[PDB]
């Protein structure tokens, strides 16, 4: 649970490593203006399929 900081959501979108980038929540470029109340970052690794 990341909180009380500033996030570089523009450049995060910029690294071309991201191959499956599905932003069902909101449009990617618009991650910059809105203020997120809180946030979780659930990380793991799964199959390619």
């Amino acid at each position: 649970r990341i909180s009380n900081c500033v996030a570089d959501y523009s450049v995060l979108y910029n690294s071309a490593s991201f191959s499956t980038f599905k932003c069902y929540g909101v449009s990617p470029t618009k991650l910059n203006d809105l203020c997120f109340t809180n946030v979780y970052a659930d990380s793991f690794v799964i199959r390619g399929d």
């Binding site: 909101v26 449009s27 470029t29 618009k30 203006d33 809105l34």
Partner: protein, 49 residues
Amino acid sequence: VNQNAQALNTLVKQLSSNFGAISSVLNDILSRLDPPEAEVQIDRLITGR
């Protein structure tokens, strides 16, 4: 007078409903999503109102 003002009250109160969209604040959806999908979202919300 009671019935007329109560009808108007229901009309105004109807604005809080998401009608199945992402939210009820029309400007929140504008800030969140992109035009090519705000299209369908705003479509649902507008047809509801």
